[PDB]
Amino acid sequence: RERVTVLGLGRMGAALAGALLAAGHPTTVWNRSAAKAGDLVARGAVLAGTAAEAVRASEVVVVCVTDYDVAGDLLGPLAGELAGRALINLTSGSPEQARRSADWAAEHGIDYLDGTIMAVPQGIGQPGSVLLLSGSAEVHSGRKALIELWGDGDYLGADAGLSALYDLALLGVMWSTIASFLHGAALLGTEDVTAQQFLPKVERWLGAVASFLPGIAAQADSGDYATDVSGLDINVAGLDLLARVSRAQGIGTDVPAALHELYARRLAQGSANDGLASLIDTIRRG
Amino acid sequence: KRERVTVLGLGRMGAALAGALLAAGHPTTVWNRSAAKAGDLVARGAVLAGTAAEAVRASEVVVVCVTDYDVAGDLLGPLAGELAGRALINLTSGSPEQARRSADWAAEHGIDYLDGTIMAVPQGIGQPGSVLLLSGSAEVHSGRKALIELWGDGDYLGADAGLSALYDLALLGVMWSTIASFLHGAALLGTEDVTAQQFLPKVERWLGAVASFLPGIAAQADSGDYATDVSGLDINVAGLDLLARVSRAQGIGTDVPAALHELYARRLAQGSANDGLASLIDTIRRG
Numbered sequence: 001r002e003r004v005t006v007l008g009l010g011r012m013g014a015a016l017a018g019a020l021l022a023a024g025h026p027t028t029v030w031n032r033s034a035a036k037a038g039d040l041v042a043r044g045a046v047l048a049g050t051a052a053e054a055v056r057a058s059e060v061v062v063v064c065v066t067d068y069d070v071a072g073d074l075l076g077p078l079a080g081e082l083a084g085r086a087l088i089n090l091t092s093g094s095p096e097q098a099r100r101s102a103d104w105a106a107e108h109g110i111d112y113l114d115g116t117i118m119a120v121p122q123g124i125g126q127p128g129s130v131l132l133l134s135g136s137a138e139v140h141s142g143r144k145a146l147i148e149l150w151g152d153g154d155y156l157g158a159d160a161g162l163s164a165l166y167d168l169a170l171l172g173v174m175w176s177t178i179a180s181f182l183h184g185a186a187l188l189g190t191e192d193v194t195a196q197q198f199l200p201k202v203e204r205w206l207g208a209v210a211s212f213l214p215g216i217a218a219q220a221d222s223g224d225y226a227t228d229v230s231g232l233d234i235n236v237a238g239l240d241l242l243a244r245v246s247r248a249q250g251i252g253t254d255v256p257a258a259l260h261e262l263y264a265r266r267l268a269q270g271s272a273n274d275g276l277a278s279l280i281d282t283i284r285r286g
Numbered sequence: 287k288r289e290r291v292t293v294l295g296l297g298r299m300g301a302a303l304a305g306a307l308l309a310a311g312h313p314t315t316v317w318n319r320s321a322a323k324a325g326d327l328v329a330r331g332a333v334l335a336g337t338a339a340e341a342v343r344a345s346e347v348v349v350v351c352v353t354d355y356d357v358a359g360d361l362l363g364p365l366a367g368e369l370a371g372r373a374l375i376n377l378t379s380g381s382p383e384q385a386r387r388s389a390d391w392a393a394e395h396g397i398d399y400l401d402g403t404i405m406a407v408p409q410g411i412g413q414p415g416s417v418l419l420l421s422g423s424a425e426v427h428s429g430r431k432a433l434i435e436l437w438g439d440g441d442y443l444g445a446d447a448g449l450s451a452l453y454d455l456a457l458l459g460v461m462w463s464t465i466a467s468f469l470h471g472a473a474l475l476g477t478e479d480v481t482a483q484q485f486l487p488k489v490e491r492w493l494g495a496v497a498s499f500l501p502g503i504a505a506q507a508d509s510g511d512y513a514t515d516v517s518g519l520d521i522n523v524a525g526l527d528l529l530a531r532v533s534r535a536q537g538i539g540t541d542v543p544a545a546l547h548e549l550y551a552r553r554l555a556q557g558s559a560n561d562g563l564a565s566l567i568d569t570i571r572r573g
């Protein structure tokens with residue numbers, strides 16, 4: 001159980017440190033303000049006096065701060081101190097910011113793995129917790145068991161920026177699945193059906209929805225959209241009806257109105273018998 | 287079991303309904319404007335009526351599945367008299383209002399009326415995980431439960447005949463969303479030469495996680511207590527914004543993220559930064 005350093009003891013940094021201690025790793029920490037380490041120190045962490053001391057304590061440095069501007073302000077000065085060590089950046093940001101950091105890290109002989117956490121702090125340590133990871137194969141490989149302490153590490157390849165990009169893509173799905181659940185909850189609420197009554201029907205249906213995705217994917221990749229069954233035409237009509245029925249029943253229309261718009265835009269450019277997969281082309285053109 | 291059944295409408299869906307009744311040894315009487323479509327069914331043992339009225343009179347329970355409720359109206363209205371005292375099961379697709387009118391009309395003519403919405407393709411009828419939302423007469427539901435389970439897992443939602451359509455539309459909303467956002471994600475990753483099928487298994491696992499968040503969200507939507515220490519509106523709205531910008535930077539459109547960003551921010555505007563995502567139901571209701 002090798003010594004690890006954590007920089008940044010916000011809610012997520014504190015949980016990374018805590019999971020290291022619960023696996024018996026000597027855990028050295030730093031934060032710009034010291035009182036935030038107090039609980040971790042009671043639990044056997046060592047609060048370093050400066051960032052630089054903290055880095056010199058461990059072969060692996062985990063950084064987790066608000067954003068990549070804060071991360072650059074903190075890491076830039078530590079360049080020579082980090083050289084020869086492994087750096088894992090679980091700060092959240094864009095593909096570009098991770099790509100920048102990876103560039104900088106390579107200048108200085110810093111083995112750089114960028115990760116994006118898909119989970120809350122209470123989630124650090126649970127196998128349900130996915131960490132997307134991208135960058136140094138060596139760091140991923142060498143410190144796998146270390147990373148697996150925070151959750152299931154999905155190593156996506158060498159482009160530092162892929163974890164952010166996958167994370168944002170997936171969050172897309174979540175945001176949109178949740179918005180539409182609450183849309184339907186509101187709609188059924190106009191007949192005094194509650195969200196908790198609706199939920200199991202939604203959970204069942206989601207099983208069907210996931211079963212549709214392999215075929216949609218296949219057509220998205222091939223470019224051959226033609227279907228005989230779930231025509232874009234009829235789906236566009238569906239969305240219009242969902243929108244109108246939502247209004248009739250007494251709620252807003254934003255969720256169905258926006259989908260109608262995008263689906264109808266493809267219908268206006270594509271074919272009546274286009275599959276839903278054809279939306280990918282409209283989405284690209286934007 | 288094995289009562290007489292009539293099916294009006296032998297389109298893709300109507301045939302597969304009659305098919306299943308028949309398969310399971312129901313005396314099945316069918317009618318369809320175009321008689322030729324009754325071919326195989328008559329061959330596998332179904333009785334083609336000469337008129338729809340003849341078909342109605344042949345059975346205590348009548349199943350109707352045609353293009354829409356306008357055609358169903360023009361087809362059923364003239365049959366009000368011969369329908370009296372029978373069970374009508376309407377599996378035509380339509381709006382809640384259309385179902386409600388149908389159930390009104392049915393009541394004012396002594397017809398027991400269950401309305402239904404099939405959440406499956408014809409080749410799914412009789413298969414596992416086909417789901418039929420049902421609403422209207424419980425008695426019809428009760429008396430014909432075995433008949434109905436031949437088609438799929440019947441889900442009786444209550445007395446109001448509009449419910450099956452209303453739930454259906456609410457569920458389709460989820461489908462249309464999850465699909466769009468799946469393709470948005472596939473588009474985005476396509477810019478780094480990741481295929482939709484490489485993306486797929488990530489999405490399949492993650493969907494399971496999203497599914498696991500919905501119980502908590504549903505509870506807050508119903509309680510009105512939106513507070514969270516973990517994923518508040520503020521960081522979600524920021525994330526949405528970031529997904530938009532990154533989408534643009536990587537070289538695709540922003541339709542899906544941009545629309546989501548706006549909707550979630552609307553609540554933020556009105557509410558608190560530490561509101562959970564459940565809070566969004568409030569925005570959608572007051573719209």
Ligand SMILES: NC(=O)C1=CN([C@@H]2O[C@H](COP(=O)(O)OP(=O)(O)OC[C@H]3O[C@@H](n4cnc5c(N)ncnc54)[C@H](OP(=O)(O)O)[C@@H]3O)[C@@H](O)[C@H]2O)C=CC1
Nearest residue numbers: 008009010011012013032033036065066070091092120516
């Ligand atoms: N929390 C969540 O639900 C999720 C979080 N994430 C990401 O995880 C990362 C960590 O977030 P978290 O640590 O919990 O956030 P907090 O704001 O709670 O902590 C951020 C850390 O940055 C430090 N910091 C240094 N300079 C600054 C500055 N100028 N302004 C603000 N903070 C500064 C803070 O020190 P100090 O103690 O002195 O403030 C603190 O250590 C983020 O990049 C976040 O977006 C990802 C998924 C979900």
Ligand SMILES: NC(=O)C1=CN([C@@H]2O[C@H](COP(=O)(O)OP(=O)(O)OC[C@H]3O[C@@H](n4cnc5c(N)ncnc54)[C@H](OP(=O)(O)O)[C@@H]3O)[C@@H](O)[C@H]2O)C=CC1
Nearest residue numbers: 295296297298299300319320351352353357378379404407
């Ligand atoms: N198929 C599917 O995947 C799904 C279907 N549904 C719903 O099931 C219902 C039936 O669709 P489906 O069977 O696929 O459609 P088809 O177009 O294959 O069949 C339409 C049926 O309606 C009849 N019809 C149309 N116009 C008239 C008219 N003026 N007078 C009398 N009969 C008429 C047709 O008679 P004729 O043969 O003489 O034209 C035929 O029996 C629809 O409400 C559909 O939306 C629900 C979910 C999915």
Ligand code: NA
Nearest residue numbers: 059083084085
């Ligand atoms: Na060293």
